[PDB]
Amino acid sequence: MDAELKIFVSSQHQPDIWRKALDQYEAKTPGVKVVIETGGNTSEMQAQYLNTVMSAKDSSLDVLMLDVIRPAQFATAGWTSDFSGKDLSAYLPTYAEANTVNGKIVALPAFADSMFLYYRKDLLDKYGIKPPTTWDELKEASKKVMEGEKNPELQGLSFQGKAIEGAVCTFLLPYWSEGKSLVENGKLNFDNKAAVDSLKLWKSFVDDGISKKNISEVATDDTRKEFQAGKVLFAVNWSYAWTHFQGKESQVNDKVGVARLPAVKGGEQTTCLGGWEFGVSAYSKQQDEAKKLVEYLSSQDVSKFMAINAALLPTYAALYKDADVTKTIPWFADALPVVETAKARPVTPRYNEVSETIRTTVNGVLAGVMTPEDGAKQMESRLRRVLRL
Numbered sequence: 001m002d003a004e005l006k007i008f009v010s011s012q013h014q015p016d017i018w019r020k021a022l023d024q025y026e027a028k029t030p031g032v033k034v035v036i037e038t039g040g041n042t043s044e045m046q047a048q049y050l051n052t053v054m055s056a057k058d059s060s061l062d063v064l065m066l067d068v069i070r071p072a073q074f075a076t077a078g079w080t081s082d083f084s085g086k087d088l089s090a091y092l093p094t095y096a097e098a099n100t101v102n103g104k105i106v107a108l109p110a111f112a113d114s115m116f117l118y119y120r121k122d123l124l125d126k127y128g129i130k131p132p133t134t135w136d137e138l139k140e141a142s143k144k145v146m147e148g149e150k151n152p153e154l155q156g157l158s159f160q161g162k163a164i165e166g167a168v169c170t171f172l173l174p175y176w177s178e179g180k181s182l183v184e185n186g187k188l189n190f191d192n193k194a195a196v197d198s199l200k201l202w203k204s205f206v207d208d209g210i211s212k213k214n215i216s217e218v219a220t221d222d223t224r225k226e227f228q229a230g231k232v233l234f235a236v237n238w239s240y241a242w243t244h245f246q247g248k249e250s251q252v253n254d255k256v257g258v259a260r261l262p263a264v265k266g267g268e269q270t271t272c273l274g275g276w277e278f279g280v281s282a283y284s285k286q287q288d289e290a291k292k293l294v295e296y297l298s299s300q301d302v303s304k305f306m307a308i309n310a311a312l313l314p315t316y317a318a319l320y321k322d323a324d325v326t327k328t329i330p331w332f333a334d335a336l337p338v339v340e341t342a343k344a345r346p347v348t349p350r351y352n353e354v355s356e357t358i359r360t361t362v363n364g365v366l367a368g369v370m371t372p373e374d375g376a377k378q379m380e381s382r383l384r385r386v387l388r389l
């Protein structure tokens with residue numbers, strides 16, 4: 001009989017392109033069929049679903065696509081089958097480390113990611129503006145362009161203010177730029193002023209009219225779609241957005257530039273480390289076939305295919321200089337130093353509680369139901385119960 005493998009893929013991760021790679025796998029693997037089980041758009045919705053099926057020890061899923069912040073939970077829970085003993089030296093060290101927990105290899109890298117500043121190069125060029133290196137320059141650039149365009153639909157800055165995993169990244173961008181860390185040598189290190197100032201920064205974009213009043217409703221792919229429609233001057237987003245901006249359903253083909261995120265004044269242009277990996281469910285009754293599929297999907301050939309066809313950043317350093325990759329997406333040639341210096345969200349088996357605390361504080365401030373000052377005190381108090389002190 002055919003082995004019918006089930007692989008969990010987010011609806012936001014371009015399952016139609018993964019399907020092409022899976023079709024190739026089936027064509028070369030007799031007796032194996034793969035079916036995509038669709039996940040929610042954002043990482044924390046995926047986590048709620050996976051917590052439910054893994055807690056029930058449901059055997060139906062075989063391969064799981066997991067966010068870079070998941071390995072500590074999934075390793076300590078015993079929810080994946082480990083690859084320990086495997087040499088990960090072919091992958092970027094960043095992701096070899098992310099997928100190793102207590103020496104146990106919990107998953108194999110799927111693709112890399114980091115946050116970038118997308119900008120409308122046609123608009124900046126019309127107004128004679130260079131890509132901003134600080135959020136303050138970004139504000140001034142937005143005010144000049146918006147006043148000039150007199151376009152009621154043009155947003156200055158789109159970022160993620162919904163209570164989603166991406167809003168954790170939102171909060172940490174200015175915090176890290178100012179040089180602060182949330183976890184220092186394994187212990188919680190919370191800087192109240194920098195936390196308040198991060199929350200105040202995002203709120204100031206809304207208060208000043210540079211971001212729309214309902215940014216508290218905006219998720220990752222909402223930013224993507226609104227910029228793609230031509231309605232946004234500046235967007236914070238991940239690498240996949242590029243393939244959509246240059247695709248057949250775009251209003252901004254050939255009008256998009258990519259830059260590093262702005263810094264706070266006197267800070268560094270830091271960004272958030274993202275990316276995904278493939279795990280074999282510990283409850284799968286297809287352990288052998290599932291492991292073989294993961295080894296294929298995490299191969300250099302598939303990494304190259306997904307970079308070219310889905311703008312997913314590769315997990316192999318050499319692919320950032322591959323002539324086909326850079327012919328398709330020239331700026332990938334400059335992306336590796338951004339990925340390798342991107343800052344990491346906290347590594348903890350209790351990451352879901354950290355995420356829930358931070359993203360709900362961000363969303364509450366942006367929705368106007370909590371002050372930045374109260375938000376930072378609530379965040380610190382709640383994180384002190386979850387993270388080592």
Ligand SMILES: O=S(=O)(O)C[C@H]1O[C@H](OC[C@H](O)CO)[C@H](O)[C@@H](O)[C@@H]1O
Nearest residue numbers: 042043113164165166220240274275
């Ligand atoms: O799920 S959210 O969108 O809220 C936040 C996530 O965003 C990216 O992944 C989603 C992209 O669409 C992949 O193409 C990062 O890679 C990930 O690490 C991060 O947690």
